[PDB]
Design an enzyme around this catalytic site. Structure first.
Site, PDB file in Angstrom:
ATOM      1  CB  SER A 215       5.973  -5.210  -0.043  1.00 57.52           C
ATOM      2  OG  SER A 215       7.837  -5.450  -0.118  1.00 57.52           O
TER       3      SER A 215
ATOM      4  CG  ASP B 225       6.668  -4.772  -8.289  1.00 58.05           C
ATOM      5  OD1 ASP B 225       7.592  -3.791  -7.732  1.00 58.05           O
ATOM      6  OD2 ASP B 225       5.664  -5.308  -7.117  1.00 58.05           O
TER       7      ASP B 225
ATOM      8  CG  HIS C 251       5.810  -2.519  -4.197  1.00 61.68           C
ATOM      9  ND1 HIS C 251       5.802  -4.166  -4.970  1.00 61.68           N
ATOM     10  CD2 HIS C 251       6.302  -2.657  -2.950  1.00 61.68           C
ATOM     11  CE1 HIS C 251       6.545  -4.704  -3.622  1.00 61.68           C
ATOM     12  NE2 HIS C 251       7.004  -3.977  -2.854  1.00 61.68           N
TER      13      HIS C 251
END
Length: 265
Positions: A134, A180, A211
Site C-alpha cells: 500500500s 482492491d 487491498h
C-alpha cells in the site's frame, strides 16, 4: 558447478518455491535501538553459504509488521536478510516510508559490521532490495527512484499520491489485487506499471483480491511467495536459474492479469 558468486542454494522447482520455507534455517531477532525508523525485526538464514543481499519491507498506512511478516521468513529461508519495520508513526506518508525503509537498510549494513549482531558478516551490503504494501509500496517505488543502486523491488497493492514512476530503473515486480477498493488496480497498480520504461518489470493481478490480498495470512502464499522469491533471486543475485519463475507467466488460475517487459532469461 556454479560460476555466479552471488548464487545461493540449489536449483529450484515450482514445488520448492511454492513451499512455506526454503532450504536455509531462519532465525530472527529484534532491533533493540532502531535508527531512522520506528521498530524492526530481522530475519536471516544461518547457512546461506555466503553473504546475501538485504531486503526491507514496510507496511501500509495504519499497519504494522504483522501485516507483512509472512515475507521475512519466506524470503530469508531462501537466502536473504529481511528487515520488517514499523514506521515512526503508522500515519507516515509514502515519502517518509522511503526514508525509513532506506534507513532500515543502512542499519542492517551497520549491524553487518557489528561483532555482537547475529547477522555479523552475513549481508552483502552492496545488494539491497525494497518491498512494501500500500503506502509502503509507494514508498518502495520512491526508494527505487531515488536509489538506482538498489537491485530489486517488489510491492503489494501500491498506493501513492502520484503514479508517475517513469524514472525507476530498478527491476520492479508489482502484485495487484483485483477487487482492491483502496488502491484500485486500474488507477494505481496498473498505471504505475505502465509508467516504468527503463527497467525489467512485471505486473501480476491476484484474482478476487482486496487491498490486503498479499498480506500475512492470504490464501495465495504459494504463488505470491514463489514469484516474490524468484524476482528477488533473479535480480538481487543474478541467479539465472530463477529466470523462468521470475520472467514467465506462472499460468496459475489465481492470476487474473499477467504482464512483463524487459525480463531477460
Amino acid at each position: 558447478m556454479q560460476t555466479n558468486p552471488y548464487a545461493r542454494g540449489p536449483n529450484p522447482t515450482a514445488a520448492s518455491l511454492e513451499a512455506s520455507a526454503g532450504p536455509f534455517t531462519v532465525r530472527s531477532f529484534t532491533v533493540a535501538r532502531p535508527v531512522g525508523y520506528g521498530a524492526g525485526t530481522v530475519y536471516y538464514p544461518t547457512n546461506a553459504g555466503g553473504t546475501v543481499g538485504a531486503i526491507a519491507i514496510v507496511p501500509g498506512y495504519t499497519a504494522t509488521q504483522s501485516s507483512i511478516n509472512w515475507w521475512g521468513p519466506r524470503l530469508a529461508s531462501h537466502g536473504f536478510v529481511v528487515i520488517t519495520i514499523d514506521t515512526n508513526s503508522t500515519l507516515d506518508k509514502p515519502e517518509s516510508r522511503s526514508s525509513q525503509q532506506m534507513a532500515a537498510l543502512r542499519q542492517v549494513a551497520s549491524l553487518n559490521g557489528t561483532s555482537s549482531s547475529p547477522i555479523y558478516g552475513k549481508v552483502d551490503t552492496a545488494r539491497g532490495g525494497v518491498m512494501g504494501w500500500s503506502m509502503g509500496g509507494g514508498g518502495s517505488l520512491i526508494s527505487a527512484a531515488n536509489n538506482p543502486s538498489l537491485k530489486a523491488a517488489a510491492v503489494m497493492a501500491p498506493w501513492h499520491s502520484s503514479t508517475n514512476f517513469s524514472s525507476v530503473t530498478v527491476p520492479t515486480l508489482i502484485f495487484a489485487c483485483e477487487n482492491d477498493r483502496i488502491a484500485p488496480v486500474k488507477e494505481y497498480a496498473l498505471p504505475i506499471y505502465d509508467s516504468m520504461s527503463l527497467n525489467a518489470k512485471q505486473f501480476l493481478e491476484i484474482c478476487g483480491g482486496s487491498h490486503s490480498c498479499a498480506c500475512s495470512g492470504n490464501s495465495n502464499q504459494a504463488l505470491i511467495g514463489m514469484k516474490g522469491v524468484a524476482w528477488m533471486k533473479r535480480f538481487m543475485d543474478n541467479d539465472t536459474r530463477y529466470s523462468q519463475f521470475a520472467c514467465e507467466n506462472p499460468n496459475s488460475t489465481a492470476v487474473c492479469d499477467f504482464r512483463t517487459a524487459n525480463c531477460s532469461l
